Design an enzyme around this catalytic site. Structure first.
Site, mmCIF file in Angstrom:
data_model
loop_
_atom_site.group_PDB
_atom_site.id
_atom_site.type_symbol
_atom_site.label_atom_id
_atom_site.label_comp_id
_atom_site.label_asym_id
_atom_site.label_seq_id
_atom_site.Cartn_x
_atom_site.Cartn_y
_atom_site.Cartn_z
ATOM 1 C CD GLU A 236 19.009 34.791 29.790
ATOM 2 O OE1 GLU A 236 18.071 35.611 29.630
ATOM 3 O OE2 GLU A 236 20.045 34.762 29.088
ATOM 4 C CD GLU A 341 20.058 31.508 25.211
ATOM 5 O OE1 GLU A 341 19.223 30.995 25.984
ATOM 6 O OE2 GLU A 341 19.959 32.656 24.789
ATOM 7 C CB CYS A 343 22.414 34.379 19.515
ATOM 8 S SG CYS A 343 21.200 35.325 20.505
ATOM 9 C CG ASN A 371 33.329 31.040 27.676
ATOM 10 O OD1 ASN A 371 32.259 30.681 28.121
ATOM 11 N ND2 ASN A 371 33.554 32.273 27.334
#
Ligand SMILES: *[C@@H]1O[C@H](CO)[C@@H](O[C@@H]2O[C@H](CO)[C@@H](O[C@@H]3O[C@H](CO)[C@@H](O)[C@H](O)[C@@H]3O)[C@H](O)[C@H]2NC(C)=O)[C@H](O[C@@H]2O[C@@H](C)[C@@H](O)[C@@H](O)[C@@H]2O)[C@H]1NC(C)=O
Ligand SMILES: CCCCCCCCCN1C[C@H](O)[C@@H](O)[C@H](O)[C@H]1CO
EC number: 3.2.1.45
Length: 498
Positions: A236, A341, A343, A371
């Site tokens: 990020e 990543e 969550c 995706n």
């Protein structure tokens, strides 16, 4: 190699977790089938957990119901795989269990007797999911990196657990490394967090030093007999552009990233013994696509070093897949898209951990299907395990995890997220290829079809609606599967097309 069912437990949410301890964890029967029949694995909000059933494949079908037609000649991406992150917090939680319970947790994820994870993301030093703040080179102004060293978080915790996962796994496992922060003395702001980037400009002593840190990291893990599939260029990079960013970060604009890759990171990796380790750019929210891809990949000096583009899922509501993933693929089809990543529970109004949340499971499987339908080659969960608070985390940035460890009970809980992830990871080995799947009518299901490396078929069908949907899957080679997608279920269908 024995089936053992879920020990369900409710905590008042939509569904149950599965309770595991030192002597018991839910598991699968041994493999396995016969031609002209299909296998179905089913998980439901009502409590079914990847339950196996079988059915016949018929030669004909008639009816006006939903038909899903496989298009095996319509070939898209090959799958790299699925996994999650070995953070300091995950390691601490796993190691808080008695060693027999630790083995059952590691097996759940990494064994063929579990869900066949083949990817592990490894933070390069500390992140929010750490209880201490450190880099590998904290001694100031050590440009030669003479005091680069792996601390115990790696040597005693992360590395030994990674070796254990590798020993349990039948599938070759790929490691992915990502840094959060550089040493503070390489940074404009002199702090692990807040707004700040590398000092100077790409091509200079700070940038050459940071690139060399990656090589030293790979050197140090290689000493412990671990090798990386890939690194990302920074976790990020947009976060270090933000005033007051609360934890470890390192800011890069896409231009800064382009030039750091072209001048420093790319050539330094390519000139190392680690030249086969792949470099993924971005490692950030997909809304940054296709812009970031255009900035980095239209510069030929950067492009020659970039293997793929890593994306995070956190702002997916802002970022329709076709405008972002789809357009990037159109423009740069030779540069793989990889989900690195995700969550749930990280928004400030969200409960960190919702034990047994079906919604959170559906969020994982809907993101995975979406995706895959937009060319992405793999999908990676964040923390492999957390505590019931969603920690530990030094900034108290607590989130949810598919496995929650309860130390006081020497117990772990497998959440619906685990099973939703397993509907993919267990049945879609590395090298599978996403193939065409068309629907005969408008419908509320999410579905994806892939072909295993041996030629067999896999179809995942998610029903996020409350309504049962009867349906038929057509494979032109074999015939028809007559089935039903219950409201709030996920199914994985397997068959040989031999
Ligand atoms: C680890 O997790 C397993 C599975 O949940 C525990 O084993 C299970 O313990 C239950 C008792 O807590 C057993 O249930 C019951 O059977 C009796 C008589 O048939 C019923 O009257 C009663 O109401 C229950 O339904 C269950 O059979 C058992 N399952 C298996 C596969 O072993 C385990 O508990 C520990 O081992 C068992 C065998 C007992 O000795 C327990 O007292 C003991 O706690 C869990 N381990 C720990 C430390 O909690
Ligand atoms: C400031 C605007 C908010 C945009 C949301 C971005 C959320 C990122 C979520 N985040 C990613 C980092 O890589 C992990 O270290 C972190 O634990 C995870 C959850 O907070």
């Amino acid at each position: 190699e024995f089936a053992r069912p879920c020990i369900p437990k409710s905590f008042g949410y939509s569904s149950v977790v599965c309770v595991c301890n030192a002597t018991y964890c839910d598991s699968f029967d041994p493999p396995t089938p016969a031609l002209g029949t299909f296998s179905r694995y089913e998980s439901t909000r009502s409590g079914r957990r990847m339950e196996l059933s079988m059915g016949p494949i018929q030669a004909n079908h008639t009816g006006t119901g939903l038909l899903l037609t496989l298009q095996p000649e319509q070939k898209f991406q090959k799958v790299k795989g699925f996994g999650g992150a070995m953070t300091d917090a995950a390691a601490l939680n796993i190691l808080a269990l008695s060693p027999p319970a630790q083995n059952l947790l590691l097996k759940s994820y990494f064994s063929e007797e579990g869900i066949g994870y083949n990817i592990i993301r490894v933070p390069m030093a500390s992140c929010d999911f750490s209880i201490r703040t450190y880099t590998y080179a904290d001694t100031p102004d050590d440009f030669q990196l003479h005091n680069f060293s792996l601390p115990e978080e790696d040597t005693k915790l992360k590395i030994p657990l990674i070796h254990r996962a590798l020993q349990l796994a039948q599938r070759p496992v790929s490691l992915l490394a990502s840094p959060w922060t550089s040493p503070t003395w390489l940074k404009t702001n002199g702090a692990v967090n807040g707004k700040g980037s590398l000092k100077g400009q790409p091509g200079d002593i700070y940038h050459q030093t940071w690139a060399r840190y990656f090589v030293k990291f790979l050197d140090a893990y290689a000493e412990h007999k671990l090798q990386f599939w890939a690194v990302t260029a920074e976790n990020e990079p947009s976060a270090g552009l933000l005033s007051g960013y609360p934890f470890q970060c390192l800011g890069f604009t896409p231009e800064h990233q382009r030039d750091f890759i072209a001048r420093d990171l790319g050539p330094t990796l390519a000139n190392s013994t680690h030249h086969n380790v792949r470099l993924l750019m971005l490692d950030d929210q997909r809304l940054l696509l296709p812009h970031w891809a255009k900035v980095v990949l239209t510069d030929p000096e950067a492009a020659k070093y970039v293997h793929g583009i890593a994306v995070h899922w956190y702002l997916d509501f802002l970022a329709p897949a076709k405008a972002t993933l789809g357009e990037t693929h159109r423009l740069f089809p030779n540069t793989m898209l990889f989900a690195s990543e995700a969550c749930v529970g990280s928004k400030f109004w969200e409960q960190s951990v919702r034990l047994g949340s079906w919604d959170r499971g559906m969020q994982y499987s809907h993101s995975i299907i979406t995706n895959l339908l937009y060319h992405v080659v793999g999908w990676t969960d964040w923390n492999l395990a957390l505590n019931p608070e969603g920690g530990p985390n030094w900034v108290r940035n607590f989130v949810d995890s598919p496995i929650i460890v309860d130390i006081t009970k020497d117990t772990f809980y497998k959440q619906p997220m685990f099973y939703h992830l397993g509907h993919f990871s267990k049945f879609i080995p590395e090298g599978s290829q996403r193939v065409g799947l068309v629907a005969s009518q408008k419908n509320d299901l999410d579905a994806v079809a892939l072909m295993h490396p041996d030629g067999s078929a896999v179809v995942v069908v998610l029903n996020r609606s409350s309504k049962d949907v009867p349906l038929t899957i057509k494979d032109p080679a074999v015939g028809f599967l007559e089935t039903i997608s219950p409201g709030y279920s996920i199914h994985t269908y397997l068959w040989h097309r031999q």
